[model samples]
Target: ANQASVVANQLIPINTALNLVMMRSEVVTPVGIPAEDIPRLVSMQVNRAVPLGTTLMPDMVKGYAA
Candidate 1:
């Protein structure tokens, strides 16, 4: 599985759902959400907070509460 990188943490905000289309990573990473699976993230509400290199895991969005 190819990992996807988060271009910027500023793009993902709290109290708002994030989309894959907006997350454009500048470079590749060793660990993170798989690029293949990323497409499935059409709409995802954040659980708590996300850092610059935060992993966009399944539980993260699945636990979305907003």
Candidate 2:
């Protein structure tokens, strides 16, 4: 995702997506929540692309989900 908006096929760490989902929507900008946080909460250990063909889901990093 851009540091300015959420979009498909953008790249980020698994934990980034994990934290992003949990943050309050009020704090979640169009760019996205801080992807620089520690202890990525994902069930996987890889950076991943956002999903294709649909709006992105908060808890999912399409390439890395179990």
Candidate 3:
């Protein structure tokens, strides 16, 4: 059931293919939501599923460089 949905949602491809990778894992695992949040943690991860400007390092460039 979930696997079907994952395949369906992955119809649109991305330049780096991060969405496809995350969706595939979500279909196979129970902790999909949390795992999917990983990309949003990194500043370079480009995905609309997560808000823009969101980062693991709260202090922006300072935190990231530190």
Candidate 4:
């Protein structure tokens, strides 16, 4: 599969979470998405200290206490 490039800002802690729209720095890139997963990030919890270029995804949203 083609790797998607949905990145997170700052160094999101393993305990912190967020939801936001895409734009500017969080540019548009294909997630091999179904269009249902865009503009709104349902819910997410950061599982790592996402370095600047780390792509946003499950490891970014689907692990913490939701």
Best by TM-score: 1
Ranking by TM-score: 1, 4, 2, 3
TM-score of 1: 0.52
Clashing pairs in 2: 4-31, 5-31, 15-40
Q: Which residue pairs does candidate 3 place in steric collision?
A: none
Instruction: Quote the RMSD, in angstroms, for model 1.
Output: 4.6
My TM-score estimates for the predictions, one after another, are 0.52, 0.21, 0.17, 0.45
Q: Which lDDT value does model 2 have at 22?
A: 35
Please write out the lDDT profile of model 2 over residues 1-58, one tens digit for every residue: 3442233333444445433343222222444423333234333333444443223344
Worst ten-residue run, lDDT, model 4?
19-28
Over all chains combined, what TM-score does candidate 4 have? 0.45
Q: Which stretches of candidate 2 lie over 4 Å from their true place?
A: 1-29, 44-50, 53-66
RMSD for each model, in Å, please?
Answer: 4.6, 9.6, 11.5, 5.4
For model 3, the stretches where C-alpha displacement exceeds 4 angstroms are 1-8, 12-14, 17-66
Cα RMSD for candidate 3? 11.5
Candidate 3 structure quality by residue, lDDT tens digits, 1-66 = 553112213332222234333333334432223334334433333233322222212222222222
What is the descending lDDT order? Answer: 1, 4, 2, 3
